[PDB]
């Protein structure tokens, strides 16, 4: 099909649209859960996924943060940041090559460090301006 969304809409309602791997971890999912056919004897149903996050073994998560420091760094930069007032007057933005994350030509009126660019969407505006300080 030439539209991924519609192909996905039709795929979602199918009985078993998910492809399941073979292993012991794949055998701990019940064949049927209160009527719903989670799997077949491999093909998988989205209900089987929902069961996994609901009932199943609690896997360990110790190196997840270390693997994903960049994203968690973004989250804490947002959380620890502070917000000022908002200026509604016209703004003058100078086109510059800026770095999105810690490159593209964007209109920026103020700090051009990657910390501000990552949030630029919520700071600049045609007829408004906001003061932001990354954490």
Partner 1 sequence: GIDFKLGQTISRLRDISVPAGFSNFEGMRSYIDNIDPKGAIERNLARMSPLVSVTPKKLTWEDLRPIGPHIYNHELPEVPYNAFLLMSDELGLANMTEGKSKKPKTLAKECLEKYSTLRDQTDPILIMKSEKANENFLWKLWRDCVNTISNEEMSNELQKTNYAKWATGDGLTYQKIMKEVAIDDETMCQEEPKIPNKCRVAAWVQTEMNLLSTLTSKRALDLPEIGPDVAPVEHVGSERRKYFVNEINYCKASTVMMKYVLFHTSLLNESNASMGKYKVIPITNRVVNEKGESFDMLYGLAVKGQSHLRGDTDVVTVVTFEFSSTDPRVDSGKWPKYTVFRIGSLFVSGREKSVYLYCRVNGTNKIQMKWGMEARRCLLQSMQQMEAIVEQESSIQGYDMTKACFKGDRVNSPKTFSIGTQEGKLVKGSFGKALRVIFTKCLMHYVFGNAQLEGFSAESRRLLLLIQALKDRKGPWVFDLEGMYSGIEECISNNPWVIQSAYWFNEWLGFEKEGSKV
Partner 2 sequence: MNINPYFLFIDVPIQAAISTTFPYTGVPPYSHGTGTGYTIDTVIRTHEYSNKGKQYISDVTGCTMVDPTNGPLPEDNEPSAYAQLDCVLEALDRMDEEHPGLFQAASQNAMETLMVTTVDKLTQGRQTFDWTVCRNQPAATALNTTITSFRLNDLNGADKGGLIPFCQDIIDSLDRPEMTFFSVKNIKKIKRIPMKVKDKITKVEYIKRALSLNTMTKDAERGKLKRRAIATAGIQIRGFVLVVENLAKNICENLEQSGLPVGGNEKKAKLSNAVAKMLSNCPPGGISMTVTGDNTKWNECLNPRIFLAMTERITRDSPIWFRDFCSIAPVLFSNKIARLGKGFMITSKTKRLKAQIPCPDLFSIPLERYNEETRAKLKKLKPFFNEEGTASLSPGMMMGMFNMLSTVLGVAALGIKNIGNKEYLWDGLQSSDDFALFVNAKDEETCMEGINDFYRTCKLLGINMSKKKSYCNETGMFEFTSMFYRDGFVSNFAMELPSFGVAGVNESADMAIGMTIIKNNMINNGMGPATAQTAIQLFIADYRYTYKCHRGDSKVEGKRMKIIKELWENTKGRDGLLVADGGPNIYNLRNLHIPEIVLKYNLMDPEYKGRLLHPQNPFVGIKEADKKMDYDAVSGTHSW
Residues forming contacts to partner 1 in the complex (CB under 8 A) are 3, 6, 10, 13, 83, 85-90, 122, 125-128, 130
* 76 Cβ neighbours under 8 A, 6+ residues apart: 135
Write down the least CB distance from residue 121 to partner 2, Å: 4
CA–CA separation, 113 and 119 (whole Å): 11
In 3D space, the residue among 66, 71, 36, 65 whose CA is nearest the CA of residue 50 turns out to be: 36
- CB closer to partner 1 out of 26 and 86: 86
Write down the least CB distance from residue 56 to partner 2, Å: 5
Pick the binder of partner 2 from 43, 106, 111, 114 (CB under 8 A): 106
User: According to the binding rule CB under 8 A, does residue 41 interact with partner 2?
Assistant: no
């Amino acid at each position: 099909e030439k539209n991924p969304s519609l192909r996905m809409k039709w795929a979602m309602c199918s009985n078993f649209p998910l492809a399941l791997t073979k292993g012991d971890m794949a055998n701990r999912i019940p064949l049927e859960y209160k009527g719903i056919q989670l799997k077949t004897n491999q093909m998988c149903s989205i209900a089987a996924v929902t069961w996994w996050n609901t009932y199943g073994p609690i896997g360990d998560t110790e190196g997840f943060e270390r693997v994903y420091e960049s994203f968690f760094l973004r989250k804490m930069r947002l959380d620890n940041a502070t917000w000022g007032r908002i200026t509604f007057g016209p703004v003058e933005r100078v086109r510059k090559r800026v770095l999105l994350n810690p490159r593209r030509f964007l209109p920026v009126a103020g700090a051009t460090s990657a910390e501000f660019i990552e949030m630029l969407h919520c700071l600049q505006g045609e007829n408004w301006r906001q003061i932001y300080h990354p954490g």
